[PDB]
Amino acid sequence: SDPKLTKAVDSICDQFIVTKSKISQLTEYFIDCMEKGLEPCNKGLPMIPTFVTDKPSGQEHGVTMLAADLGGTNFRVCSVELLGNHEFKIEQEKSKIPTFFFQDDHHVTSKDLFQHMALITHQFLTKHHKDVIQDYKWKMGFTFSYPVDQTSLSSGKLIRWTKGFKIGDTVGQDVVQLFQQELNDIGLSNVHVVALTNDTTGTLLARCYASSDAARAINEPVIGCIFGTGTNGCYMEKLENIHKLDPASREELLSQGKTHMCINTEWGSFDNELNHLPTTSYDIKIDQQFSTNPGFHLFEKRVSGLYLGEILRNILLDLEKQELFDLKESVLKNNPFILTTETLSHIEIDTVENDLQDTRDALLKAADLETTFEERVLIQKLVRAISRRAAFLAAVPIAAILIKTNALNQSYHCQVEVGCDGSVVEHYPGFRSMMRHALALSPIGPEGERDVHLRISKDGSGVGAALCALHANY
Amino acid sequence: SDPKLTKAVDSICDQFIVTKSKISQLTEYFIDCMEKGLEPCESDISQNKGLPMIPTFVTDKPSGQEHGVTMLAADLGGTNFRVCSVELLGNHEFKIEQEKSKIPTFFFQDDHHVTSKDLFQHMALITHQFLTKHHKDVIQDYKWKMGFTFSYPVDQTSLSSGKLIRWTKGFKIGDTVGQDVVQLFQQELNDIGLSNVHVVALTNDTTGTLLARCYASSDAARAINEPVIGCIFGTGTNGCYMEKLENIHKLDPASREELLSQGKTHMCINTEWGSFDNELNHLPTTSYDIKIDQQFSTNPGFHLFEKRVSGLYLGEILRNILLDLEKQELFDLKESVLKNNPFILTTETLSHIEIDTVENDLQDTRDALLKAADLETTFEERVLIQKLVRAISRRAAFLAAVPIAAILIKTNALNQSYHCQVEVGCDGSVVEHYPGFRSMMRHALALSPIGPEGERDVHLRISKDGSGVGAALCALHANY
Structure with missing residues (x-):
């Protein structure tokens, strides 16, 4: 119960507080950045057109589309069968991206990546649609959740690799052409990539369907x-x-x-x-x-x-430099990202009546960090401070969009849906609860939050991509 | 456009307003009635103003992992009798087979001296009909456990025993009051060869909805x-x-x-x-x-x-409002049939008016009123009818939130832990299908003493199949 440590933790926690005034300030600045980005080309958001102008009704049926998703770990190819009445049949396959693409000493080229994607695409069709692999007129939606200067529904150039990719010669090139050329070169010229989409766009369309x-x-x-x-x-x-x-x-x-x-x-x-x-x-x-x-x-x-989790690691390292926290032969030092957001999940709602066993166990499993009960009480305070800041900042873009588009007061009983995917908003305990708090503090107020619904919407990288391709031409 | 009619309608609408102070008053008074009703009944010294607060002898919320053999469940309501089989698979899932049959109008006429034997003998036959259809091969072999959902006040003395206090819906079978309905049902099941169907649980539609939501x-x-x-x-x-x-x-x-x-x-x-x-x-x-x-x-x-x-x-409140406006010669009923046809205007009719769009000159309102009572209407009249409907439904939604707010305060359920969220599992045609009814309930909750801070942690979740899955869960844990 070191009072010096306790006063240090309380002061660190206060640095993570997001006030009502700060939420208002950021919400106003976000709308300003939204408008700057809509002007032709700054301090404005990218505001990149997606060229999707039609929300699905939910009754589209009688078609099977293809969809490909390049992520940070796996490449997915699937077929999406729209059955109408808000239902679909999906067949999918995932294959790990070779680690050479995330290391920059292997002379990795765009042809290496997009030829491998074409191979996985060919393997998928050979397994699940062998009879119609070379004959069918497939329409495919390419989910590419990376900064892209989109100029049409089917054309966009990579601006910058994120998620650790290291393929230099992809920047500045239309990724739809790079993918299509490799699809042609392996005998899948009948697979036309007709849409370039984001995982965000797909999440919205998937929720509409x-x-x-x-x-x-x-x-x-x-x-x-x-x-x-x-x-x-x-x-x-x-x-x-x-x-x-x-x-x-x-x-x-x-x-x-x-x-x-x-x-x-x-x-x-x-x-x-x-x-x-x-x-x-x-x-x-x-x-x-x-x-x-x-x-x-x-x-x-x-x-x-x-x-x-890394924020917590650096907070405890800084507390150890001040000789206020004893790591007692842990492995937190020189191991970035060893404390993950999953570790914090077991600490957020851990009960003190259980002497914070889940917290004790979660820290031993991650870095053999032995802890006292009083230390765990204070570590929990740090975690709860970290997550609330993330949750409150997470609400700012949502509040700003609802205000700019005046979406809340459109009709009697008007309710709005925010389709959400992601490990944090979906599984981090109370993250959505804290986002709803920030929304109530934002300029939309409690009256507006009551009409906002943060709903989890999965299948954005599959059904969402298929929906973009439906209205486009083969 | 008739300003005389408009002034009357607006003044009628103001009579349905439920204020924040009124919600507070009713919420506090509801908690008092909750406490009066939990006290034993020595006399009626201000205790007659207390809620029934009837013990159900259900003490365990399901976890969601309960599983086992197919259970039976029967549900008697004010309109339908339901029989179903529920297979609890654990992991929050179940397979359900059910059949619905309307209660014969013979039970709603009071000139035939209808008795308990008539009702429970009919239920036993329907149960036999259900088992013969969906479980023909094992109707006489299995040791079926059944949970009886009985949505009426019952002086319950155990999980499997309770005497009817009063018929509260649309029919009255006099000789049932004061009798154990589980015994009345079990005897008729025995008499038709279903003695292997043991009614091991008597539950309410409210209890079953809660248990189904826990699972x-x-x-x-x-x-x-x-x-x-x-x-x-x-x-x-x-x-x-x-x-x-x-x-x-x-x-x-x-x-x-x-x-x-x-x-x-x-x-x-x-x-x-x-x-x-x-x-x-x-x-x-x-x-x-x-x-x-x-x-x-x-x-x-x-x-x-x-x-x-x-x-x-x-909907009936609306009918009497339109009849009263015609007595004052402010509203023309024309060749309608609202007079001497009670309940002809249903809540479904009002559902089409609540969110009807005025930019389309309220077409759904026009159609819903012609189909329901051949009432022709003008746009100005439809504007005012929509106002009346919205006033009626908002009052219902605001009063609906009072008991919920009172329970959350009485049990201090909101401030139990960091990130504490509470679920109110609810069924019914109105809370499920009436447009904006729950949205307006959330508004009233935010006005109640729990405030906006509390509403954000309350979740009104629609929970179906409560009178089946809930009953099946009581029968799973009970002994044959």
Whole structure:
């Protein structure tokens, strides 16, 4: 019960507090950054057009689409059978990405990556659709959740590799052409990649297709966002406000009956100048020393589940330098990311009436960190401070979008749906509960939070991609 | 456009307003009635104003991993008799086979001296019909365990024994009052060769809804979420919650100690909150509420709270409002049939008006009123009818939140742990299908003494199959 340690922990916890005033300030600045990014090309969000202008109804049926997803660990290819009535049949296969693609001393080229993806695609069709592999007229949606300068539904150039990829010659190239050329070269020229999509876009479309007609009567999906190891979100913006879009293209869509286009905000790079975002010593150390892309996606680094546990590690290391916390032969030193957000899951809701056994056990399993009960009480305070900051900042982009689009007060009993995927928002105990708190503190107030629904929406990288491809031409 | 009619409608709408202060008053008064009703009945010295608060002898919430052989369940309501088989698979899943049959109108006519043998002999036959259809090969071999869902007030003395206190819905079989309904049902089952079907549990539709929600609530949910209430909001209303055994004073003190020694800490209580404040000491009341109770109710004087929130009377309140406006010569009923046709306007009719869009000149309202009573309407008239409907439904939704708020305060269920979330598992046509009913309930909860901070931690979750899965869970744990 070292009072020096206790006073140190309380002061560190106070550095993570996000006040009502701060939420308001960031919500206003986020809308400003949204508008700057919609202007033609800054301190504005990427606000990247996705060229998706139609939300599915849920009754589309009578078609089978293909979908491919390149992630940080696996490459997935699947077939999506739309059955109507909010249902679908899906067959999928995942294969690990060779580790050579994440190491930069192997002369890895874009042809190596996209030829391997074409191979996996060929293996999938040979297994699940052998009779129609070379004959069928497949339409495929390519889920590519990386910074991409999208110029149409089927064309976009890689801006920067994230998630640890190390393929240099992909930057600046249309990834749809790179993938299509390899698909042609292995005898799958009948597989046309007709859509380039994000996991955020897919999450929104997937929720629109599964959202029942009775549910969708008063509920309306307005946002598709991810809160996992990374963060991002998308929403529907009025065509008139997307000034960076070719004004001639705008009129073409307006005459065809379109009124909105989904925007990939890429809000992980929100306020990278840190003009208003919080910043602790631990946030700076994580950015400049333990990040694959130092200086980028700083907002992401304050909410993502990849860094939450690391924030705690650096807090305990700093407490050990002050001779306030005894690591007692642990393995926290010189082992970045050894404390994961999963470790914190067992500490967040751990009960003190159990002498914090789950906390004791969770720390021994991760780094053989032996602890006293009084130390665990204080470690829990640090964890709860870390997660609340992430949860409160996570609500800012959502609040900003609902205010800009004036989506809450659209009709009597108007309810809005925020489709959410990701390890943190889905499984971190009380994360969504704390997001709802921040929303109630944000300018939408308690009245608005009551009409907002954070609903978990899975299958974004499969059904969502298939839906983008349905309306496009083979 | 008639400003005379508009001024009358707006003034009628203001009579249905439930204020924040009124919610607070009713929430505090409801907690008082909860405590009066948990006390034993030595006399009626202000205790007659207490809620029934009936012990159910259900003391264990399912975990979600319960599993075992197919159980049977029977459900008698005010309209239908249901028989089903429920296979509990563990891991929050189950397979259910069910059959529904309407209660013959023979039971709703009081000029035939209908007896308990007629009812329970009919139920035994339907049960036999169910087993012969879905389990023909094993109807006579298995040792079936059945849970009996009986959505009526019952002076329950154990999990498998309880005497009917009063028929509360649309039919009255006089010789059933005071008799154990499990014994009446079991004897008729024996007489038709289903003596191998043992009725081992008597449960309420509220209790079953709570138990079914405990079984479906995920293990990850059970970390922070905890089901605390099972409620019904349909043609009737009622709810249940878990009370500490120490607080159930009407229970035999020896039974209290016996259960505490067995590791029990709470028992589910059937509040029967449909009879809340039948003296109308604080509930709102319009002339239309009085007219419906004394002239169009099968049980005049009873379940007045229910008559202000249940979906059986919401549409009827509108009918009496339109009839009263025609007596004042402000509204033209034309060639409609609202006169002398009670309940012809149903809550489903009002469901199409609640969210009907005015930018389409309220077409759904036009169609719903022509189909229901051939009432032709103008746009200006439909605007005003929609206002009346929205006033009626909001009052129902606001009063519906009062018992829930009261239970959460009485049991201090919101502030039990960091990130403490509570689940109110609810069934019924209104809370499930009436557009915006739950949204308006959440509003009233935020206005109640739990405040916005508390509403955010309350989750009104629709829980179906409660009268089956809930009964099956009682029969799984009970002995054949």
